[PDB]
Amino acid sequence: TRRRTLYRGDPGMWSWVLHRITGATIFFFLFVHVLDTALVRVSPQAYNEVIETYKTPIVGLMEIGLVAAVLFHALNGIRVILIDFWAKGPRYQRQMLAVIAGLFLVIFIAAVGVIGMHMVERF
Amino acid sequence: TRRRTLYRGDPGMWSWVLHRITGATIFFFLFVHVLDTALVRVSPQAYNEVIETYKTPIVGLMEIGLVAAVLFHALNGIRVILIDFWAKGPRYQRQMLAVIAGLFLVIFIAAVGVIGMHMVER
Amino acid sequence: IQEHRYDVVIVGAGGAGMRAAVEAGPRARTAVLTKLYPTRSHTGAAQGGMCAALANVEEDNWEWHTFDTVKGGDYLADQDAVEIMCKEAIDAVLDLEKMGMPFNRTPEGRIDQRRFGGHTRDHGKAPVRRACYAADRTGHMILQTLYQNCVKHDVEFFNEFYALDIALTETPAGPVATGVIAYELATGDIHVFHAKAIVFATGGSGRMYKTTSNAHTLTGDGLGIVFRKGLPLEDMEFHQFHPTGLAGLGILISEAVRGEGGRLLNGEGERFMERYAPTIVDLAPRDIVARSMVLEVLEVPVYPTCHYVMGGIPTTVNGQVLRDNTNVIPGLYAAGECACVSVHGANRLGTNSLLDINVFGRRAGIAAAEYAQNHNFVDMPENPAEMVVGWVGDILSEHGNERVADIRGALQQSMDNNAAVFRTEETLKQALTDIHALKERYSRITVHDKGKRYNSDLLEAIELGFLLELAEVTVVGALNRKESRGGHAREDYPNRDDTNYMRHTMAYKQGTDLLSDIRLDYKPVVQTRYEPME
Amino acid sequence: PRGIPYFEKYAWLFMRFSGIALVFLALGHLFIMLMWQDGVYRIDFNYVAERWASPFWQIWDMALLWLAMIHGANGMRTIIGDYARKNVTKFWLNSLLLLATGFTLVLGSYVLVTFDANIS
Amino acid sequence: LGRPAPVMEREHDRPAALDHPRAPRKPRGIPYFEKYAWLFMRFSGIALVFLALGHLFIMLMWQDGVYRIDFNYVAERWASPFWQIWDMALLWLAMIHGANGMRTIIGDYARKNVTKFWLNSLLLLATGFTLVLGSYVLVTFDANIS
Amino acid sequence: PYFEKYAWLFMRFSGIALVFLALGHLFIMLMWQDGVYRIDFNYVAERWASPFWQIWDMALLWLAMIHGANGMRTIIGDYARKNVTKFWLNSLLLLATGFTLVLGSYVLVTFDANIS
Numbered sequence A: 001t002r003r004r005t006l007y008r009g010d011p012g013m014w015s016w017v018l019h020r021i022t023g024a025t026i027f028f029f030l031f032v033h034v035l036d037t038a039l040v041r042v043s044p045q046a047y048n049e050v051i052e053t054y055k056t057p058i059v060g061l062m063e064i065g066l067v068a069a070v071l072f073h074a075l076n077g078i079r080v081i082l083i084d085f086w087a088k089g090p091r092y093q094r095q096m097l098a099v100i101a102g103l104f105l106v107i108f109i110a111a112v113g114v115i116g117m118h119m120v121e122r123f
Numbered sequence B: 001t002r003r004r005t006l007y008r009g010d011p012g013m014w015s016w017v018l019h020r021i022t023g024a025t026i027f028f029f030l031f032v033h034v035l036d037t038a039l040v041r042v043s044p045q046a047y048n049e050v051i052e053t054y055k056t057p058i059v060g061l062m063e064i065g066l067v068a069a070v071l072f073h074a075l076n077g078i079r080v081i082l083i084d085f086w087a088k089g090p091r092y093q094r095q096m097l098a099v100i101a102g103l104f105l106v107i108f109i110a111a112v113g114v115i116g117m118h119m120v121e122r
Numbered sequence C: 001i002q003e004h005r006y007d008v009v010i011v012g013a014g015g016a017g018m019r020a021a022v023e024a025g026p027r028a029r030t031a032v033l034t035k036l037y038p039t040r041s042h043t044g045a046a047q048g049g050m051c052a053a054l055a056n057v058e059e060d061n062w063e064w065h066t067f068d069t070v071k072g073g074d075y076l077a078d079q080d081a082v083e084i085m086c087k088e089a090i091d092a093v094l095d096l097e098k099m100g101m102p103f104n105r106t107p108e109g110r111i112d113q114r115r116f117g118g119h120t121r122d123h124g125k126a127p128v129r130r131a132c133y134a135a136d137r138t139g140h141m142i143l144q145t146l147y148q149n150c151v152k153h154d155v156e157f158f159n160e161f162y163a164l165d166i167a168l169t170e171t172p173a174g175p176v177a178t179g180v181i182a183y184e185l186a187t188g189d190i191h192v193f194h195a196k197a198i199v200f201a202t203g204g205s206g207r208m209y210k211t212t213s214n215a216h217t218l219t220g221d222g223l224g225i226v227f228r229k230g231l232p233l234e235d236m237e238f239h240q241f242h243p244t245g246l247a248g249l250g251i252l253i254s255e256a257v258r259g260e261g262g263r264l265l266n267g268e269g270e271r272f273m274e275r276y277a278p279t280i281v282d283l284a285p286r287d288i289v290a291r292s293m294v295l296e297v298l299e300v301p302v303y304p305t306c307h308y309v310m311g312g313i314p315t316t317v318n319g320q321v322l323r324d325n326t327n328v329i330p331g332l333y334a335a336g337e338c339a340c341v342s343v344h345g346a347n348r349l350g351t352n353s354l355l356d357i358n359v360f361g362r363r364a365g366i367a368a369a370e371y372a373q374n375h376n377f378v379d380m381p382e383n384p385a386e387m388v389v390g391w392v393g394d395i396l397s398e399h400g401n402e403r404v405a406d407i408r409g410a411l412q413q414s415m416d417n418n419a420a421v422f423r424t425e426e427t428l429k430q431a432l433t434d435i436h437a438l439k440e441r442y443s444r445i446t447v448h449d450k451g452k453r454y455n456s457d458l459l460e461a462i463e464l465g466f467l468l469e470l471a472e473v474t475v476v477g478a479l480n481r482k483e484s485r486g487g488h489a490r491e492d493y494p495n496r497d498d499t500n501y502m503r504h505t506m507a508y509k510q511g512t513d514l515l516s517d518i519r520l521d522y523k524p525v526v527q528t529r530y531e532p533m534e
Numbered sequence D: 001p002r003g004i005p006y007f008e009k010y011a012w013l014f015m016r017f018s019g020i021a022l023v024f025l026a027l028g029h030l031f032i033m034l035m036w037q038d039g040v041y042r043i044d045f046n047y048v049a050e051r052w053a054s055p056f057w058q059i060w061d062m063a064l065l066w067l068a069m070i071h072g073a074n075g076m077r078t079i080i081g082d083y084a085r086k087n088v089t090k091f092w093l094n095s096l097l098l099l100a101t102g103f104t105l106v107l108g109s110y111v112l113v114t115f116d117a118n119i120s
Numbered sequence E: 001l002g003r004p005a006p007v008m009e010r011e012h013d014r015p016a017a018l019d020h021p022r023a024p025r026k027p028r029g030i031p032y033f034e035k036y037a038w039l040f041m042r043f044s045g046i047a048l049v050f051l052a053l054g055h056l057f058i059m060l061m062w063q064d065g066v067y068r069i070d071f072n073y074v075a076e077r078w079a080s081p082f083w084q085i086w087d088m089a090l091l092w093l094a095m096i097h098g099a100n101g102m103r104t105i106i107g108d109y110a111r112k113n114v115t116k117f118w119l120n121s122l123l124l125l126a127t128g129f130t131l132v133l134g135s136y137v138l139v140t141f142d143a144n145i146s
Numbered sequence F: 001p002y003f004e005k006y007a008w009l010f011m012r013f014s015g016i017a018l019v020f021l022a023l024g025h026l027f028i029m030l031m032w033q034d035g036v037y038r039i040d041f042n043y044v045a046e047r048w049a050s051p052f053w054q055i056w057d058m059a060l061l062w063l064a065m066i067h068g069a070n071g072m073r074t075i076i077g078d079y080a081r082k083n084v085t086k087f088w089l090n091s092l093l094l095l096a097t098g099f100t101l102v103l104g105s106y107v108l109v110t111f112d113a114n115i116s
């Protein structure tokens, strides 16, 4: 028997689950992408072939998704490092969390705007 | 509260103080040497510039001081290694110290003579 | 039906139970029977301090404490045991500290003490700063420390084991206690623990009142068990009703109002306590304060709540269950709030309870361990669990038109409207008729589980039986005592008749079924130096 | 005493310190790649070759590779330790992780160290 | 009146019960790390005698000392496997030697454990930076840089 | 602690890898075209102009040297009677292994075809 139920606890819990998910995302991408970059010790034409197949609109929205993942992971990791090293850290947990929510929204709407204007002028 | 006391102990104590001081001197100099040598991957002219500024009389006196630091550190470190490995080391401590005082004197005055000749002929 | 061969067997895990367990832990092969976990015990509810004359902040000796404790109990306390308790109280507090308890410390670093109630300088002069405390949470720290030490010395706890009766073996020199028949809640299996000594530390019994301050698990089972085995109970009609009682439910309000400017304003918009009892503002004894408030109501909201029971199993100083006035049951000990060593007498002084449990739990544990070392196993009768197994089976396999909840609710409502802070003759007789009717209704009740894994209506019904017995004892004793002394207070006879009633009253169970009679004997009060005066 | 003593303390500290460094490394990489001149739409072999003709970017990319791979490998070690129920599964998954991490570090280091602009 | 009790708390992060008088002294680090750091200082000193003193001799005393040194001199010396390996061994041995020595120095001059932690972190950072920069310059050097 | 368990496991795993590495090396060297009788600097230079063979030889060097060094550590531990002898023999082994790894890695990393 296995019951299925949602705990509905702190917001730091959802921060941690997003942290874990985005970290694993970047790890798998990094494996694949170090390979395709290692294709540069083979041929300029091989490298150009591959990275040109990386210039499609699907891969563009995926670039936006990966930008989001790395940005959230970086901000939340700063929060975690602060909690651990700063002695008054655990008191301002939720303050830091709201601050990095704000920073993420700002920087990410800016980054989507820039990447979007590039994708627009490229079509 | 804090009192100022000179303990006035063994000569091995002053050997250890000098060993510590000269070792830290070499450590900091080495940080700087490695940076200014890393400057060899940017251009020939940048490297030539900074080392031409390292060929002055002030830096010549400093290089003599660095020779002294490295020489004393090496010799007293040989003494320390012998004390730790050779089973009759601790007996002959304080004779090793006289030996390395003499060695430092001869090697240092020879080296400073050669370096002073180089610095004169310019 | 398992059977364990053991030595000193402690029934309870509160302050007294775990004190006895850390004493008789190394000395013998001890088992501890608890119906809760050792840290869910009432002791943990204790917010106040624990007073012992350590003389750190001020200077005070143990004779001042002895006088305070003898005058508080309205001259019914055995002054032998009072002296012994104070003298050992100093060292009991120190031993708790040396076991690791986090007391509050003085600028110099010994132990901090603060004032409490009627602990006065010498025979009524000034407060003394006597009560040693840990925080707003003193009983919890005592409980945690004793449990940590029982963990350290690797005591064998039997958690959630409802001890339902004891096996008394009869010998030519009388009866002798052999084993305890427990009911493991977790598996339904009856266990029989064979012991040489048996310590009862099962706490008090306030749950026979509607509005009370005791845990839901404080029904009174040491009292009920030793009262069913034929042994007596001492002066059960002395219940201390606390004044601050959160008129809604009954929770105690000794949280903050105690050591501050609590303006007891009641009636419509008036202050009363000095209109009634001047010469002291509001630090009068708890029973006096409660009588005042109640007779005021008879002419944040608070209301008195049954708080403590001064009666219980009669006991010597070394912790032995004396059978009548001078005999003793061999191999049977008692400690804590279930035991009546006759220290509080007719009214309990604040902070003397944790003190009492420490001192006399240690004494009873030592005594039971050394008895188990000296003597040996005596015998046991044939399959001594027949009565308990028949009891449980009879309760289980039957169907009746009564519910434990309704019987218990009616018992508590009657015992609260009648045998309470003010009680009268016709009042107590109404209570007696009500308890007899409820006792004959308890014969036909039902349980709705019939399972054997975690059966709780079963034990709820058994505890209701215990409560009915103790309620009968209380009402009949309080109908007997025709005076107003201490927590007891009658409106027919309103002043302390010291010519006939300066004597403990003891109750013996004649029959064996529920509806039976009770014989009321007496017991003299040991007197050393403090003759009555007021 | 289940593993190497004081290994968990230093893995913990390494995650913190490599995070502090990877903020700059990874976010500067993403910035300069995606939102500087034409983003991806300027990237090709010539772009890579003129970027890797600079000690700055060479050391930047090697530090990024090593820090990111050791960081991710330690994090996935933690994830495996929290999700694998059988000890044999945990053993073989940690071995697969170690193999893939070693292969990626070897390949990336080879490419960086050996890259030559003039290949054809 | 009595004598106020002595406070045993050194700093907030330090359990006082760690410096209890009757507390058992047990090792507070990786086992056998100090033995091997000690042995490393001895052996790397034996190697550094030759490496460092030969470096100093050839630089300062051989032909015209520093007054001959420039890019072309460096580029002629590093065209030889002998001098390449000599300088790589010198860099690695000297930096690990000095960093372990300064580990000792910090450990016995820092009064607080927080200061010790952060100075050891700064030391490890500076040593790592110098090692990777020197290794990069040695490995990836080309005389035809311009 | 746990150093012997991991040295044991390393011998097993490096053996599995070294089967392919070492036996492919021996095959391609001795019994492909003319065996040794074709080997010279030009052969080495055209073999080491390939990422395949470069990584093959570096993996072979590192795995083979750590494997052999651990095995000889075991042999010394089983044959050396005095603790001083064991100490100085393990130090000589560590020195020779480090020197060989340093020299082989230098040669691989720094090899240039156009030397004269």
Ligand SMILES: Cc1cc2nc3c(=O)[nH]c(=O)nc-3n(C[C@H](O)[C@H](O)[C@H](O)COP(=O)(O)OP(=O)(O)OC[C@H]3O[C@@H](n4cnc5c(N)ncnc54)[C@H](O)[C@@H]3O)c2cc1C
Pocket: C011, C012, C013, C014, C015, C016, C017, C033, C034, C035, C036, C037, C038, C040, C041, C042, C043, C044, C045, C046, C047, C048, C049, C139, C161, C162, C163, C164, C201, C202, C203, C204, C213, C214, C215, C221, C222, C252, C307, C308, C335, C336, C337, C338, C350, C351, C352, C353, C354, C355, C357
């Ligand atoms: C709210 C409140 C506040 C109080 N404040 C104070 C104060 O400030 N100062 C003070 O001195 N006193 C105070 N008291 C009273 C005092 O704490 C008690 O005298 C003391 O707690 C007595 O505990 P005990 O050792 O008798 O056992 P308790 O801790 O009361 O518990 C009895 C134990 O026996 C076990 N047990 C019971 N029945 C059975 C059974 N049938 N089978 C097996 N095991 C059983 C239970 O597991 C339980 O742990 C307070 C009481 C209450 C309710």
Ligand SMILES: CCCCCCCCCCCCCCCC(=O)OC[C@H](COP(=O)(O)O)OC(=O)CCCCCCCCCCCCCCC
Pocket: B035, B038, B039, B042, D054, D055, D056, D059, D060, D063, E125, E128, E129, E132
């Ligand atoms: C464990 C720690 C490891 C640290 C690794 C992190 C590295 C992250 C990126 C850092 C790269 C450093 C390489 C420098 C190469 C470079 O800039 O030099 C490369 C530059 C080209 O830079 P750009 O193309 O980006 O403009 O060439 C120049 O023309 C620079 C002109 C003069 C610069 C002098 C720098 C020489 C050495 C001084 C270093 C400064 C550090 C000071 C410390 C006190």
Ligand code: HEM
Pocket: A016, A019, A020, A023, A024, A026, A027, A030, A073, A074, A075, A076, A077, A078, A080, A081, D015, D016, D018, D019, D020, D022, D023, D026, D068, D069, D071, D072, D074, D075, D076, D078, D079
């Ligand atoms: C290549 C880039 C990165 C990769 C592959 C990566 C991967 C991971 C993974 C898989 C985890 C495990 C998550 C978990 O255990 O819950 C993790 C944790 C962590 N990451 Fe990263 N991450 C990267 C970048 C960053 C950055 C830029 C920071 C900036 C501070 C950072 C800070 C942290 C921290 C502090 C942790 C520890 C989290 C914890 O222990 O709870 N990471 N990383």
Ligand code: HEM
Pocket: B016, B019, B020, B023, B024, B026, B027, B030, B070, B073, B074, B075, B077, B078, B080, B081, E041, E042, E044, E045, E046, E048, E049, E052, E053, E094, E095, E097, E098, E100, E101, E102, E104, E105
């Ligand atoms: C040149 C030959 C050298 C020899 C023979 C040598 C020997 C030694 C020895 C044996 C010690 C340990 C001393 C002790 O523990 O008491 C030591 C310490 C030290 N060495 Fe060296 N060393 C040499 C070069 C260097 C170099 C090149 C550096 C730095 C770049 C250096 C920096 C240090 C430092 C800082 C210490 C710590 C001093 C102390 O803790 O007392 N040494 N040296």
Ligand code: HEM
Pocket: F011, F012, F014, F015, F016, F018, F019, F022, F023, F064, F065, F067, F068, F070, F071, F072, F074, F075
């Ligand atoms: C070619 C494929 C190889 C395989 C499959 C292999 C496998 C093994 C294994 C499993 C062991 C452990 C034996 C034991 O623990 O009892 C071992 C030991 C050893 N190996 Fe290898 N090995 C290989 C190649 C090599 C190479 C290339 C070297 C040296 C360069 C080497 C040197 C040694 C030595 C010296 C031992 C110690 C023997 C002992 O302690 O009994 N082996 N080998």
